Design a protein around this ligand. Structure first.
Ligand SMILES: [Ca+2]
Length: 223
């Protein structure tokens, strides 16, 4: 997260860290045994880390649970990043409390102008690299479908929306991938891709979760 703020320990209780020896992606807890992330975060040997603030220090509210199964969306296209979503089932159910909680799935798609909260442990600098150890937050609006398509000609599908600032300065970045975009208490997006970070006229692009509610629900009900 570039140009964000320090969230505060456990103020984003649905945020998860995916770990394969090191943090490599974010995700969101949607019930006691399932995590949603980006399909481009796929790999084998994932451990899901819940209740994290400082990802380098054991602070007392963590739960570490291995993944038992990962399901990449059936139509994921790694070249275009269309359908950039994936579900991960946990080996055992998480213990839900005030600091580890699920986030509701949306019943309707959010409109442009809606203010959202984006969070992650990604790079905080638009040139160079500095990776934070504690969770960073960003308030950003959803941008109009027309300004999004004008920023990225030929690359935006109906499964994507843009959020952020056309002036630049504030954005998600490398290592925020797979993390949540939450608007009015509902999971509306997944950190997917961008052109660099926080560059002028290049806002971040996010997977449009409201398009996938039926697939998520049916997948969970049968796995
Ligand atoms: Ca920790």
């Amino acid at each position: 997260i570039v140009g964000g703020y320090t969230c505060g320990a456990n103020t984003v209780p649905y945020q998860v860290s995916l770990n394969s020896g090191y943090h490599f992606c974010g995700g969101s807890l949607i019930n006691s045994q399932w995590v949603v992330s980006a399909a481009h975060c796929y790999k084998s040997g994932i451990q899901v880390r819940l209740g994290e603030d400082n990802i380098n220090v054991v602070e007392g509210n963590e739960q570490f649970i291995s993944a038992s199964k990962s399901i990449v969306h059936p139509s994921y296209n790694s070249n275009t990043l269309n359908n950039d979503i994936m579900l991960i089932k946990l080996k055992s159910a998480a213990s839900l409390n005030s600091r580890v909680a699920s986030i509701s799935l949306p019943t309707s798609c959010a409109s442009a102008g809606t203010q959202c909260l984006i969070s992650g442990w990604g790079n905080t600098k638009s040139s160079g690299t500095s990776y934070p150890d504690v969770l960073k937050c960003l308030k950003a609006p959803i941008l109009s479908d027309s300004s999004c398509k004008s920023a990225y000609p030929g690359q935006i599908t109906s499964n994507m929306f843009c959020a952020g600032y056309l002036e630049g300065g504030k954005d998600s970045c490398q290592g925020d991938s797979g993390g949540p975009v939450v608007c009015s208490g509902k999971l509306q997006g997944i950190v997917s891709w961008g052109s660099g970070c926080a560059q002028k006229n290049k806002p971040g692009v996010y997977t449009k979760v409201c398009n996938y509610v039926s697939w998520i629900k049916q997948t969970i009900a049968s796995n």
